[PDB]
Design an enzyme around this catalytic site. Sequence first.
Site, PDB file in Angstrom:
ATOM      1  N   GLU A  67       0.818  -1.202   0.000  1.00 31.21           N
ATOM      2  CA  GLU A  67       0.000   0.000   0.000  1.00 31.21           C
ATOM      3  C   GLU A  67       0.859   1.262   0.000  1.00 31.21           C
ATOM      4  OE1 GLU A  67      -3.264  -0.325  -0.560  1.00 31.21           O
ATOM      5  OE2 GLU A  67      -2.834  -2.478  -0.547  1.00 31.21           O
ATOM      6  N   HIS A  90       1.393   2.336  -3.370  1.00 34.85           N
ATOM      7  CA  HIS A  90       0.287   3.111  -3.927  1.00 34.85           C
ATOM      8  C   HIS A  90       0.435   4.556  -3.461  1.00 34.85           C
ATOM      9  CE1 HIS A  90      -1.899  -0.055  -5.808  1.00 34.85           C
ATOM     10  NE2 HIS A  90      -2.252  -0.674  -4.694  1.00 34.85           N
ATOM     11  N   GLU A 132      -2.332  -1.881  -9.274  1.00 33.58           N
ATOM     12  CA  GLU A 132      -1.906  -3.007  -8.440  1.00 33.58           C
ATOM     13  C   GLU A 132      -0.728  -3.735  -9.070  1.00 33.58           C
ATOM     14  OE1 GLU A 132      -2.696  -3.460  -5.549  1.00 33.58           O
ATOM     15  OE2 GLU A 132      -4.712  -2.699  -5.186  1.00 33.58           O
TER      16      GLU A 132
HETATM   17 NA    NA Z   1      -6.680  -2.510  -2.261  1.00 29.87          NA
END
Ligand code: NA
Length: 432
Positions: free
Chosen positions: A232, A235, A271
């Site tokens: 994460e 991201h 992703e």
């Molecule tokens: Na997610």
Amino acid sequence: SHMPITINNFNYSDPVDNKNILYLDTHLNTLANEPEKAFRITGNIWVIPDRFSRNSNPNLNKPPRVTSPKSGYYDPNYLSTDSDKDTFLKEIIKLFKRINSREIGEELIYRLSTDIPFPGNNNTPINTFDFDVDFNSVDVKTRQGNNWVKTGSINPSVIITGPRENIIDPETSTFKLTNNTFAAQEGFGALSIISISPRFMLTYSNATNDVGEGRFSKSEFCMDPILILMHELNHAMHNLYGIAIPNDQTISSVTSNIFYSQYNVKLEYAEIYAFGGPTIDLIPKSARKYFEEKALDYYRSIAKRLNSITTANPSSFNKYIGEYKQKLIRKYRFVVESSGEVTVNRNKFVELYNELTQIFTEFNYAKIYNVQNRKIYLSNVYTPVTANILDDNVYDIQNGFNIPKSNLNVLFMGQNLSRNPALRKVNPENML
Ligand code: NA
Ligand SMILES: [Ca+2]
């Protein structure tokens, strides 16, 4: 990471100090009815150990209907008590320390905690720095009498919170006002919120490291909590540097879990990059180039803005325009001409873009931190497991679960469900 990163330590009960512990109002958590206690992990990275939701009339109970096939774990009481929050808070802190134990992790934290979103969005005037744009500025409040009053605001780059409805579905998002577009996808970048609970570990058998079981029966392994979190943080990196790829950019694929055999899923390119490795080749080369060139154009537009700033919002920032111009120049690695004009250097851009999308990846971290991990993002998953990661006899900063003392340092045995009793399946009563 020039000045060594150190992770702050907290007890949820530690008093507000108007510096590293404050009550915030993000105006985004539908589960929050009053200011939320927040803690500064380091720099501009904060953590609010509460459940988070974006749904109106939120409900954390297990859904009666069964959307799926996506695996889900629900517990309306998880993180409801201060005791729960204290443990969650300490888990996040411990994971950051472990991430910080390797050079790449220290740099990851340094960047996320130091560089900031450009102050503005698509609708910000070219000559303006707007530190309150969209949701970048979070209100700081203190209780006065029986109420809460705003006393100021802070600009976190990343806020880590507890899970949303589905506890085993970590989610990183940026936010915008209705009439705007996502600044995170346009070079500016924006504040990211990561809702997650790393101790709820995904399990798999299709792993990156061969442990010699290919001809026999392959063991199930758990993901190390730091990789679940770092995934994460990748991201967040894309969001911070304004290179996030819209979630409508996907490739139709398949995967499976405990309740559903091979089913369809729209795999987001976002992703794919967060995971990294050979999987990146699933994105058509021409498309990968397109997104990179699009980012470069947004960067050129940013440099243009930097050569035009004359005003700032709020006004108190006017006197610091030069300071922030310099910080942003360093962030994007722009070049300053002898004339003082800010320009984009393609060679520098290409290097930065490559770092953000191919070096800071889960796949790379698995190798660097020497832990077992899923071979691909869509590796089939089994029943999630958890453990008391705050117990150094179970999980420590240096080796995670693969502790030599516990004789779990050979062939990633600490992550092997059949070899580490410390790993326990999550409550089946809450699975869906
Ligand atoms: Na997610
Ligand atoms: Ca605000």
